[PDB]
Coordinates of C-alpha atoms in Angstrom, one line a residue:
Chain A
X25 CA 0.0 0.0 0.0
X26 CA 2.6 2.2 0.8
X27 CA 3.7 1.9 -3.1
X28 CA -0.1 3.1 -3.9
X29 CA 0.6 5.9 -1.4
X30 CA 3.3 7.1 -3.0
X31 CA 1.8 7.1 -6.1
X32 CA -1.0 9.5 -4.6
X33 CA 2.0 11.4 -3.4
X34 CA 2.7 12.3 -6.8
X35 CA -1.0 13.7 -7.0
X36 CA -1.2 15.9 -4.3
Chain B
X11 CA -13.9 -9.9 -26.5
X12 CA -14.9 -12.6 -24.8
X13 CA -14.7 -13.4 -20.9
X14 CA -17.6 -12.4 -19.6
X15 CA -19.8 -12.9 -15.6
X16 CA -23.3 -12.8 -15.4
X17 CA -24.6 -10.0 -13.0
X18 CA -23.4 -9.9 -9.4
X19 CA -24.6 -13.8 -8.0
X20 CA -28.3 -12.6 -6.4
X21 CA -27.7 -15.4 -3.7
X22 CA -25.8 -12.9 -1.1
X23 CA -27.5 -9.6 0.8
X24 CA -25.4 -6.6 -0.6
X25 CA -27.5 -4.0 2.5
X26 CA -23.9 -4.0 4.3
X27 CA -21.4 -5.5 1.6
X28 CA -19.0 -2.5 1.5
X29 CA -17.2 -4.4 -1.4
X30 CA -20.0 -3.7 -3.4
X31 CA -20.5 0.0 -2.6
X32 CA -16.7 0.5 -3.1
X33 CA -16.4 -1.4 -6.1
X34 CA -19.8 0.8 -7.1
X35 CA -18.1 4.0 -6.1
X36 CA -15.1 3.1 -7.8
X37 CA -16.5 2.3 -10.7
X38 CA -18.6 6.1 -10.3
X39 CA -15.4 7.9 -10.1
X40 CA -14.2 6.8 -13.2
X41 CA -17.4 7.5 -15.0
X42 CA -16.8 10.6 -13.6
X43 CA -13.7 10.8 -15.5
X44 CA -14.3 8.8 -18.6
X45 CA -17.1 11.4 -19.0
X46 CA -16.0 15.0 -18.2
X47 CA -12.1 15.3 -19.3
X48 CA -12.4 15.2 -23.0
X49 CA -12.9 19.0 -22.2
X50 CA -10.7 20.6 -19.2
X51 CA -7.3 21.3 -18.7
X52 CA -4.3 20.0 -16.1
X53 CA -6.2 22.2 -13.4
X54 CA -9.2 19.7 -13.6
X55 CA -8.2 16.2 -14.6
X56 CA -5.3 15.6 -12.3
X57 CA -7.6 15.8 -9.4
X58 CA -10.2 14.0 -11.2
X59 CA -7.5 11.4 -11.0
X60 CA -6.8 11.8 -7.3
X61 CA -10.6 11.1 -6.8
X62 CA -9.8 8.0 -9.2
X63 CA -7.5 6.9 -6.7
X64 CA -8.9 8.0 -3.4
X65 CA -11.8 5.9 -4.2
X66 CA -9.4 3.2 -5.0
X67 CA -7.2 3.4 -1.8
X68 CA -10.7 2.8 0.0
X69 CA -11.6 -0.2 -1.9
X70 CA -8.5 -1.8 -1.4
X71 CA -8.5 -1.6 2.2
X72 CA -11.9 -2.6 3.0
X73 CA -11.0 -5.4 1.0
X74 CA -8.2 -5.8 3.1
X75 CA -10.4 -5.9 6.2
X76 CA -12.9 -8.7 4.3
X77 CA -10.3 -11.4 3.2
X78 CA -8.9 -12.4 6.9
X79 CA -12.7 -13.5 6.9
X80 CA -12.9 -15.8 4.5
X81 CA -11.4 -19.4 3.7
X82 CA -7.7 -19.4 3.7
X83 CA -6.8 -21.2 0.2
X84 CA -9.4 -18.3 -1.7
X85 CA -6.8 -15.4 -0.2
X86 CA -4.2 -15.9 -3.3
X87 CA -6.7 -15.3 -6.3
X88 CA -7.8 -12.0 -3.9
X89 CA -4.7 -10.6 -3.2
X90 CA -3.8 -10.5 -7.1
X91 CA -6.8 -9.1 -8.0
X92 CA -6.3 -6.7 -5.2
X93 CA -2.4 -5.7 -7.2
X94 CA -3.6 -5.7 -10.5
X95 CA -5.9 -3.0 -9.8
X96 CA -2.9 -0.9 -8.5
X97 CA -1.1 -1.2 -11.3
X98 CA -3.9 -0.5 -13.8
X99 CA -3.8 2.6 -11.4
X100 CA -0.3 2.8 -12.2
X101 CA -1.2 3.4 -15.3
X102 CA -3.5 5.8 -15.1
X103 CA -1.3 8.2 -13.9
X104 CA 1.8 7.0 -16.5
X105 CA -0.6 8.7 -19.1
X106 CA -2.1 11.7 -16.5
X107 CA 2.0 12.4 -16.5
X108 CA 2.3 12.6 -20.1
X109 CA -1.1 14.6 -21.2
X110 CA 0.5 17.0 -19.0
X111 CA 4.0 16.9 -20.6
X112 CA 2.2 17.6 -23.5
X113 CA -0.7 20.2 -23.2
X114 CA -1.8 22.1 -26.4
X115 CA 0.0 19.8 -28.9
X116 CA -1.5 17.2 -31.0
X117 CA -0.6 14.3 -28.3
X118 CA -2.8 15.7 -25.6
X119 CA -6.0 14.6 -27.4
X120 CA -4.1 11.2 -27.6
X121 CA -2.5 10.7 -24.0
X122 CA -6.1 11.1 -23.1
X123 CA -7.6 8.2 -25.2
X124 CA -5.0 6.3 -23.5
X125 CA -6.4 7.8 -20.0
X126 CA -9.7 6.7 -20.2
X127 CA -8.3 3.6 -21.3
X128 CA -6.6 2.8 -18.3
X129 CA -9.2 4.0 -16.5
X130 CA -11.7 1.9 -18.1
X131 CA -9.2 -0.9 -17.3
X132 CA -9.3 -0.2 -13.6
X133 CA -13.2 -0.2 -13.1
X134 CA -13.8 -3.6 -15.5
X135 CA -10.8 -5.1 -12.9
X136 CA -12.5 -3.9 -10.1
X137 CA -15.9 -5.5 -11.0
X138 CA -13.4 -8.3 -11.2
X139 CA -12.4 -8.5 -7.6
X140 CA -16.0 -8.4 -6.9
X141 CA -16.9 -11.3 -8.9
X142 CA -13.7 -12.9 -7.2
X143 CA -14.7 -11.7 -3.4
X144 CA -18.7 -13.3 -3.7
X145 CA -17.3 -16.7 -5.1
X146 CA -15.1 -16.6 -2.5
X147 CA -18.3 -16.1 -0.2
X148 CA -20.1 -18.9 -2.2
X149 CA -17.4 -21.4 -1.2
X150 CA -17.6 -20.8 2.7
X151 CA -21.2 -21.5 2.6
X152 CA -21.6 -24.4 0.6
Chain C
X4 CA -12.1 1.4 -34.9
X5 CA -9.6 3.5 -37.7
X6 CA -8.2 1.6 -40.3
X7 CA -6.0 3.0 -43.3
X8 CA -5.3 1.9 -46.8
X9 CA -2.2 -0.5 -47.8
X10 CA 0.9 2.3 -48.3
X11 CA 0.3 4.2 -51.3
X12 CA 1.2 2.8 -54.4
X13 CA 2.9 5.9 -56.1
X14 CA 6.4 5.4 -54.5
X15 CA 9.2 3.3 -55.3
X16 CA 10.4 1.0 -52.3
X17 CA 13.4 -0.5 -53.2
X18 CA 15.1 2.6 -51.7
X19 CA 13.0 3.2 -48.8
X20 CA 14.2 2.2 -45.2
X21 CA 11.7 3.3 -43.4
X22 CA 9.0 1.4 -44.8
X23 CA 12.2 -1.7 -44.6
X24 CA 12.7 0.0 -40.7
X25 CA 8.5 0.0 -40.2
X26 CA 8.7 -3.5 -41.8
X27 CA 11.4 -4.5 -39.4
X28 CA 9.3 -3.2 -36.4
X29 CA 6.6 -4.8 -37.2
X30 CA 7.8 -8.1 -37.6
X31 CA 10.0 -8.2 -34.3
X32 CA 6.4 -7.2 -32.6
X33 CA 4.9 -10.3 -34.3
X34 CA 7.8 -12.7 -33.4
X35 CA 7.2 -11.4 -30.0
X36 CA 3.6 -11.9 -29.4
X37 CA 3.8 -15.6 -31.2
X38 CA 6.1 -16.7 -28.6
X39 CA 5.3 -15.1 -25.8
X40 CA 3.0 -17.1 -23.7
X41 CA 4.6 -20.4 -22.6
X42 CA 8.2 -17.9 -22.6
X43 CA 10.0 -17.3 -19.3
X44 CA 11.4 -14.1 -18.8
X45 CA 14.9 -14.9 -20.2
X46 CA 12.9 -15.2 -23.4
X47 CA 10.8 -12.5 -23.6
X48 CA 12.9 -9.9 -21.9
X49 CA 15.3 -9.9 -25.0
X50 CA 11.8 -9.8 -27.7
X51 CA 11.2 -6.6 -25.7
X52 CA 14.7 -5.9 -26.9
X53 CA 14.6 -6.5 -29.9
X54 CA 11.8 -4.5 -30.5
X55 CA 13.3 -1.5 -28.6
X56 CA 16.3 -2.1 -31.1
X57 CA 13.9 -2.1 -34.1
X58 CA 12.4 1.3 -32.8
X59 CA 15.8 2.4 -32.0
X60 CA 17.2 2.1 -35.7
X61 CA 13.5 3.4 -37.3
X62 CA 13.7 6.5 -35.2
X63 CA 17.4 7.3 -36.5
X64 CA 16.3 6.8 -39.9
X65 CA 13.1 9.4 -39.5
X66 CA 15.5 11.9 -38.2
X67 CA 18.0 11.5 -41.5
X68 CA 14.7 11.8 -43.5
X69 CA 13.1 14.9 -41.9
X70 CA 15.6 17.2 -43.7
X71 CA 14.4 15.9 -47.6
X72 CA 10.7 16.8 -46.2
X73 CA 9.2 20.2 -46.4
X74 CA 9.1 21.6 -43.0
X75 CA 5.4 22.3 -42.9
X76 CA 5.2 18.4 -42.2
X77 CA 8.0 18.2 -39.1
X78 CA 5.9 18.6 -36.7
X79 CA 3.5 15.9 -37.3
X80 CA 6.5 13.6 -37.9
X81 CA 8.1 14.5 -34.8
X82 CA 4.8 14.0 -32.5
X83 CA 4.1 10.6 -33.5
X84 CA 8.3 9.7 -33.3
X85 CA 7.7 10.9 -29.5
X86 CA 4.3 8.6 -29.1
X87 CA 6.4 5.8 -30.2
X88 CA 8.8 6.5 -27.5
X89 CA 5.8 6.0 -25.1
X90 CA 4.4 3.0 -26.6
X91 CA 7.8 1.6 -26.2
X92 CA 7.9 3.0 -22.5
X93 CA 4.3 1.3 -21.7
X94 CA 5.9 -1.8 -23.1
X95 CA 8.9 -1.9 -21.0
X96 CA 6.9 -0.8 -17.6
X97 CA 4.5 -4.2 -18.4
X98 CA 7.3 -6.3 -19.3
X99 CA 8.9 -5.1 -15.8
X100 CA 5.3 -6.4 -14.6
X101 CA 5.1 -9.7 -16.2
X102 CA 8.9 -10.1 -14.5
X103 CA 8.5 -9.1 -10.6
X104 CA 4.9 -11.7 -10.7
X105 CA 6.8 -14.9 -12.6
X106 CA 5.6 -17.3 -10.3
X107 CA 2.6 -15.9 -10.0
X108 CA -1.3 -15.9 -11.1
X109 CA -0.5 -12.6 -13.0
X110 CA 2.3 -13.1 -15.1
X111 CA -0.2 -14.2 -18.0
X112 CA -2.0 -10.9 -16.8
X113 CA 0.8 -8.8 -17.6
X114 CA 2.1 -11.0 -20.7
X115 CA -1.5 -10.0 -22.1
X116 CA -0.7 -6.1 -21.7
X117 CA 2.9 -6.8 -23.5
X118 CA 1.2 -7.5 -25.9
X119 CA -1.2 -5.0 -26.1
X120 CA 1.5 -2.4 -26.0
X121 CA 3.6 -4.0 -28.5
X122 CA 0.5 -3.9 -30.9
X123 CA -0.3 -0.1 -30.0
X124 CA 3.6 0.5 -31.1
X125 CA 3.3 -1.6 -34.6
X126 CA 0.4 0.3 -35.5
X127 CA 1.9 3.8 -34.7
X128 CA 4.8 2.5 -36.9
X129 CA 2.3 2.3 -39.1
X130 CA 0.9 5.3 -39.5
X131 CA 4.1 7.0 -39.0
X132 CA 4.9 6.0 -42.6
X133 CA 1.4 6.6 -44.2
X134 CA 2.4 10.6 -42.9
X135 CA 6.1 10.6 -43.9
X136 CA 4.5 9.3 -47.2
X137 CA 2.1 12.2 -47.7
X138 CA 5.4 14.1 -46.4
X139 CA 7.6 12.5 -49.4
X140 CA 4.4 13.0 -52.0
X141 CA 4.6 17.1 -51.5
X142 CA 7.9 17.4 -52.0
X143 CA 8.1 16.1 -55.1
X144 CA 4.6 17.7 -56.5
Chain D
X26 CA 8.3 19.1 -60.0
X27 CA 10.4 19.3 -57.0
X28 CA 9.4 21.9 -53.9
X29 CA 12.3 24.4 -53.4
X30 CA 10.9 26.3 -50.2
X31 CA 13.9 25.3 -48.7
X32 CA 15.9 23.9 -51.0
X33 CA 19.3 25.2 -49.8
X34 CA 21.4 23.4 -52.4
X35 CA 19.4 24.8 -55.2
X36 CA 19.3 28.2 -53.1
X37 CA 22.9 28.3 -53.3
X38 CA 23.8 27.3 -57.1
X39 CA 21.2 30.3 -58.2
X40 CA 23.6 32.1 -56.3
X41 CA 26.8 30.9 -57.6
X42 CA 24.8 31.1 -61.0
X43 CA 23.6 34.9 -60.2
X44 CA 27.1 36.0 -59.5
X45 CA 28.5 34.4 -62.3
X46 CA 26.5 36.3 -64.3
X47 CA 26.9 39.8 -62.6
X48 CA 30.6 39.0 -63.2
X49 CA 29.9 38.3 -66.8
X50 CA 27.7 40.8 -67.7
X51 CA 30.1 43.8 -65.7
X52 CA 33.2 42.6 -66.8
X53 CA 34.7 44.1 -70.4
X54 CA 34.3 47.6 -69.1
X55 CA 35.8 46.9 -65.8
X56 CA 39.4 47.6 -64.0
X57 CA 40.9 44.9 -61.8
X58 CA 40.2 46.5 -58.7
X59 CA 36.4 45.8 -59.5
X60 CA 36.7 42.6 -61.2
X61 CA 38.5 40.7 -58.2
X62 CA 35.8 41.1 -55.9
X63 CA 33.8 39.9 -58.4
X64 CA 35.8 36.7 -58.7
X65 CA 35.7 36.9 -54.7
X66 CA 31.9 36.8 -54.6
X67 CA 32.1 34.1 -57.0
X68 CA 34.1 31.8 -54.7
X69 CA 32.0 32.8 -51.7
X70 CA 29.1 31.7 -53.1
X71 CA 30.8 28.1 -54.7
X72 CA 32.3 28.2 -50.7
X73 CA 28.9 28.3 -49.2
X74 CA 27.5 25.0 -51.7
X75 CA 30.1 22.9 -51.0
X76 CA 29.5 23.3 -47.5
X77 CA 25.9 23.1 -48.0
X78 CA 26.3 20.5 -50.1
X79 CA 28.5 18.3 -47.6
X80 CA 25.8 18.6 -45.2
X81 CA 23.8 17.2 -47.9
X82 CA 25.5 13.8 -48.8
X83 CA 24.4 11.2 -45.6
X84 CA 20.6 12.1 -46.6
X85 CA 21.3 10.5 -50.0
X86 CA 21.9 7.0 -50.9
X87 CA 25.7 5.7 -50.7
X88 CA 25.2 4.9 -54.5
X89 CA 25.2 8.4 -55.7
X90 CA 28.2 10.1 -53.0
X91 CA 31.2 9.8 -55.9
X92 CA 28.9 11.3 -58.9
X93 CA 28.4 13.9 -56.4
X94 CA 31.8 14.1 -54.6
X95 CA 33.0 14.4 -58.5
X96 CA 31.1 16.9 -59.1
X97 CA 32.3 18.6 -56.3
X98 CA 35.9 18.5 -57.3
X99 CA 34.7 19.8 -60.6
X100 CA 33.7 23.0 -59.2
X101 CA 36.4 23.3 -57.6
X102 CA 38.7 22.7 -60.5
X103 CA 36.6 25.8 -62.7
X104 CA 36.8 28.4 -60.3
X105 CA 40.9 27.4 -60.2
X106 CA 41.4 28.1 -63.8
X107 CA 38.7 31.1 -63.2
X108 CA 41.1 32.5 -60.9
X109 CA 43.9 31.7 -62.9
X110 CA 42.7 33.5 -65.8
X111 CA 42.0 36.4 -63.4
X112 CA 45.8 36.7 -62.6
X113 CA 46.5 36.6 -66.1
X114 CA 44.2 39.6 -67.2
X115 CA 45.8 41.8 -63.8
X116 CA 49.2 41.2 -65.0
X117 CA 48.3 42.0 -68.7
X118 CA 46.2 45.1 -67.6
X119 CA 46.1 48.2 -70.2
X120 CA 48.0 45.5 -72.8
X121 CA 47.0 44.1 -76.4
X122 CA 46.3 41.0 -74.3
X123 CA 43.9 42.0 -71.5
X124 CA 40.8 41.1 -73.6
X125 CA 41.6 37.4 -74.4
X126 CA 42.2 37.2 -70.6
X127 CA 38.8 38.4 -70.6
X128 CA 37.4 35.9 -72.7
X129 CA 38.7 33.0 -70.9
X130 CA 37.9 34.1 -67.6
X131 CA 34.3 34.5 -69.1
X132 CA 34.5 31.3 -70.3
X133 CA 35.6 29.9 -67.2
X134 CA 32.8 31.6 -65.2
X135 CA 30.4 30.1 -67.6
X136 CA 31.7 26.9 -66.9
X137 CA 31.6 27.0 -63.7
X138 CA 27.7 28.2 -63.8
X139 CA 27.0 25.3 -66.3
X140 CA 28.9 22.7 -64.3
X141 CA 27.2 23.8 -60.8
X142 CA 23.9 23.4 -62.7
X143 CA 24.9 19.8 -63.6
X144 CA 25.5 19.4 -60.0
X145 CA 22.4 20.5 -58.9
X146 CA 20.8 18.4 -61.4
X147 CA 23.0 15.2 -60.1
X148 CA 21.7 16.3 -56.3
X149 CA 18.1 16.3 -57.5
X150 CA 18.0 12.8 -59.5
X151 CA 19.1 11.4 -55.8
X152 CA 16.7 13.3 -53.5
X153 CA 14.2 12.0 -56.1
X154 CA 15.8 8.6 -55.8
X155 CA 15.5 8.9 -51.7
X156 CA 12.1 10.0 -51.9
X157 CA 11.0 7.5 -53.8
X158 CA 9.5 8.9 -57.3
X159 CA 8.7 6.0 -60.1
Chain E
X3 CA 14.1 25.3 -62.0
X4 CA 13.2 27.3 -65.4
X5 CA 14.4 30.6 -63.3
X6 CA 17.8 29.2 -62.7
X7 CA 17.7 27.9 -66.6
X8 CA 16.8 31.4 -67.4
X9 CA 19.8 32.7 -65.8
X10 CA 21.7 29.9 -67.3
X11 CA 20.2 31.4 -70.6
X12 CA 21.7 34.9 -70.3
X13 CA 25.1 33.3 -69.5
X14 CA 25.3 31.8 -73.6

C-alpha cells in the first residue's frame, strides 16, 4: 500500500 | 472480446457489503472521469484522477479488512486481483504524467484516449475483484 | 475502430528504409507476441529488446529523412516519433510487470498487456509511414 | 516538379549562378580592382555550396556520393582556372592581351555556372531517388 | 528550375 501511497504522493 | 460474468450472484444480501458499494463507487469515479475530461485542462483532470485513486485506496483496504474472513486457500486469487488493480492505477497516472507533458500539442488529445483507457481498465478489474470476493463467499457456505 | 489503406502505391520501395525500418518493427512485434506465452522471462525480456532495437534504428532513420521533407510536415513527424517512444515505454513498464509476478497468477496478466502495447507500437509505426508518405508526395509535386 | 521552399542546395547554385552572371555581364568595361571582388563573390558563393552540399550527402543514398563528390571537385577545379585567368588579365592590364584574358575568364565563369547546374541536377535525380519517385 | 535555366540562358 505504501507503493499506492506514493503514487497519490505524486497527486497531491 | 470474450470473458464475460453474469450479473453480481443474487444469492448474497449486498445492504452491508461495503465491497460492493466501493467497487460501485469506484466504478462512479471513473465514470466521472471517462465522462467529463475530454474538455478541461491539467487544473481539472489531475484531481479528477486523485478522486480515481482516493476511491481506489478505499476499496483496497476494505478489501483488506474482508479477506482475513474468508477461507484461507481463496486469499491468493484476492490478493492479485487486489495488485492488479494498482497497477492498472499505475497506469492511469503514466498517461495523466504525459497529457501533462504535453498540453496544447497534438498528443494531448491522444494521451487522453489512452487515460480513459486505463481508466476503463481499472473499473472492469474492479468488478473483477467483486466477482472474485462473492465466489469466495459462495465457497464458505456451501 | 480506424483503419488505413495499404501504403500508397505511387512510390518506389526498393530505396526506402523506413517502410524496410516500419517493416522490421513490425515483424519483431509479431515474433514477440507468437512466442510469448509459454516464454520465461529470459525469453521474452530480449523480444522486448529487440523491439526496442527495431524502434531504435526506425527513429534514427526518420530523423535522416526529416531534412528531404518540407518543413510544414516536421511537426507531425516528430509527435508521433515521440508517441512511439511511449508505446515503447508502456511496453517496458509491463514487461517489468510480467517479471516481478513470474511465479505468479498474473504473469499471464501482464504477458496480455505486452502484448497489447507491442500492438499499440506496430500500429503507430504504421501510420508514421502513411504521414512521412504524404510528407515525401509534396515534396516532389 | 520538386518543392524548393527550402531547397538550400538549389538556393545556393542560383547564387553561384547569379554571380557568375553579374561578373559576366560587368566585366569588359571593368578595372581589376572591380573585377576581383567579383571573382571573390564568385568563390564565396561556390564556398557556401560545397559546405551546404557536404551537409547534404548522408541524406542521399551511398550509391550516388562519388557522382556527387566528383562533381564537387569539378567546381572546384573551374573556379581554379577562373582564378587563374584572373591573374593573367591583372598582369596584362592596359596591354594588347587584356581582352583574351577576358574571354577566358568569361568562359571559365560560364563553366563554372554550367557545371554547378549539372551538379544541382545530379543532387536532385538522388533526392528524387530517396524520396522514392517512379 | 526554369528561373535558374533562365539565368543559365543569359550566360550563352
Amino acid at each position: 500500500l505504501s507503493e499506492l501511497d506514493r503514487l497519490l504522493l505524486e497527486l497531491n | 472480446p470474450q470473458e464475460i460474468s453474469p450479473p453480481p450472484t443474487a444469492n448474497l444480501d449486498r445492504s452491508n457489503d461495503k465491497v460492493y458499494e466501493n467497487v460501485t463507487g469506484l466504478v462512479k469515479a471513473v465514470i466521472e472521469m471517462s465522462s467529463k475530461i475530454q474538455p478541461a485542462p491539467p487544473e481539472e483532470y489531475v484531481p479528477m484522477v486523485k478522486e480515481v485513486g482516493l476511491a481506489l485506496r478505499t476499496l483496497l483496504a476494505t478489501v483488506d479488512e474482508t479477506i482475513p474472513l474468508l477461507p484461507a486457500s481463496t486469499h491468493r486469487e484476492i490478493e492479485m486481483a487486489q495488485k492488479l488493480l494498482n497497477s492498472d492505477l499505475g497506469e492511469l497516472i503514466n498517461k495523466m504524467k504525459l497529457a501533462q507533458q504535453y498540453v496544447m500539442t497534438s498528443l494531448q488529445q491522444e494521451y487522453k484516449k489512452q487515460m480513459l483507457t486505463a481508466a476503463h481498465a481499472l473499473a472492469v478489474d474492479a468488478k473483477n475483484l467483486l466477482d472474485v470476493i462473492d465466489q469466495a463467499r459462495l465457497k464458505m457456505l456451501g
